[PDB]
């Protein structure tokens, strides 16, 4: 499976959602959000082979187009299929507010 | 728009479907297909900004996560949303056959 459960290993480099904790201010510097300090944004990296969870037929073709030529960066593009919200807390002028951003997290990538 | 019509320019480096003609044998070396020699496989490259056609909410966040740190390859992943078939011609033993591969081409990418 290509989720953040099996992608949290040390091997495999194909379409696998890798950890990507993002500290709102450290990484995005977001100033409109106070808490939490960050979150498990996660993300997907690595190209896609010809046997992975290829969804489109162009994912198996271009997959070889790259696996054949070394140095070619036209491989496919693994992406976050399912996502997750994000319970934060920002400030509007002077009143504190807590919300839940939508799709502000990853729970499973794929190969589009 | 992020299609193969506006992406066929010389500027812009974000989620834009770039040309990717693939010569079945030259690039994929495919031996199960005789014709055509190749096709306009096309593909998508470049990361995704925070104003492009972001579809998921995680595309605007990780978008800055990379745009903020130089050298970070955890950016988003532009992908071929719509695709196109492909009229080919291969051989089964000794009989010639013509088909139309499905999604064997790109007609518009996006940012998953």
Q: Which CATH number is B55's domain given? A: 2.10.90.10
Q: What are the start-end ranges of the H helices in B30-111?
A: 58-68
Between CA A22 and CA A37 the distance in angstroms is: 9
Length of chain B: 112
Per the entry, the structure determination technique was: NMR
Whole-angstrom distance, CA of residue A67 vs CA of residue A73 = 10
Nearest to A64 by CA among B6, B43, B2, B68: B43
B32: nearest Cα among A32, A72, A60: A60
Q: Are strands B78-87 and A100-111 parallel, antiparallel or unpaired?
A: unpaired
Provide the number of structural domains found in chain B. Answer: 1
Cross-chain residue pair B57–A104, CB shorter than 8 Å: yes
Q: Where are the alpha helices (DSSP H) in A2-74?
A: 58-68
Six token digits for residue A36:
């939490």
d(CA B75, CA A92): 29
**CA B88 to the chain's CA centroid:** 19
> Quick check: helix, strand or coil at residue B89?
strand
Give the helix, strand, coil percentages of chain A, each rounded to 5. 10, 35, 55
Q: How many CB atoms lie within 10 A of CB B35?
A: 13
* Interface contact flag, B74 A43, Cβ < 8 Å: yes
Using beta carbons and an 8 Å cutoff, which residues of B are at the interface with A? 18, 20, 22, 27-30, 41, 43-45, 56-58, 61-62, 64-65, 68-69, 73-74, 76-81, 83, 101-106, 110, 112
Distance from CA of A33 to the nearest CA of B (A): 12
> Cα distance from A2 to chain B (closest Cα, Å)?
15
CA B20 to chain centre: 8
* Cα atoms found within 13 Å of the Cα of residue A23, Cβ hemisphere only: 5
Query: Helix, strand, coil shares of chain B as percentages rounded to 5?
Result: 10, 35, 55
Nearest residue to A28 via CA among A43, A41, A45: A41
By the 8 A CB rule, do A66 and B106 touch? no
Residues with Cβ < 8 Å from A105, sequence gap 6 or more?
A39, A40, A41, A42, A83, A84, A85, A86, B58
Selecting from B29, B45, B62 the residue whose C-beta is nearest the C-beta of A41 gives B62
Give chain A positions within 8 Å (CB) of B69: 27
Alpha-carbon distance of B61 to A50, in angstroms, equals: 30
Q: Look up the domain containing B105 and give its range.
A: 1-112
Beta-bridged to residue B19, according to DSSP, are none
Residue A55, burial from CB neighbour count under 10 angstroms (0-12, 13-18, 19+): middle
Q: Are B46 and B73 contacting, i.e. CB atoms less than 8 angstroms apart? A: no
Separation CA A57–CA A71 (nearest Å): 23
Q: Which residues of B touch A105 (CB under 8 A)?
A: 58
């Amino acid at each position: 499976a290509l989720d953040t459960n099996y992608c949290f290993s040390s091997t495999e480099k194909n379409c696998c959602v890798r950890q990507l904790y993002i500290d709102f201010r450290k990484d995005l510097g977001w100033k409109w959000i106070h808490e939490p300090k960050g979150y498990h944004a996660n993300f997907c990296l690595g190209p896609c082979p010809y046997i992975w969870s290829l969804d489109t037929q162009y994912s198996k073709v271009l997959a070889l187009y790259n696996q054949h030529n070394p140095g070619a960066s036209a491989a496919p593009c693994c992406v976050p299929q399912a996502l997750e919200p994000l319970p934060i807390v920002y400030y509007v002028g002077r009143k504190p507010k807590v919300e839940q951003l939508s799709n502000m997290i990853v729970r499973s990538c794929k190969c589009s």
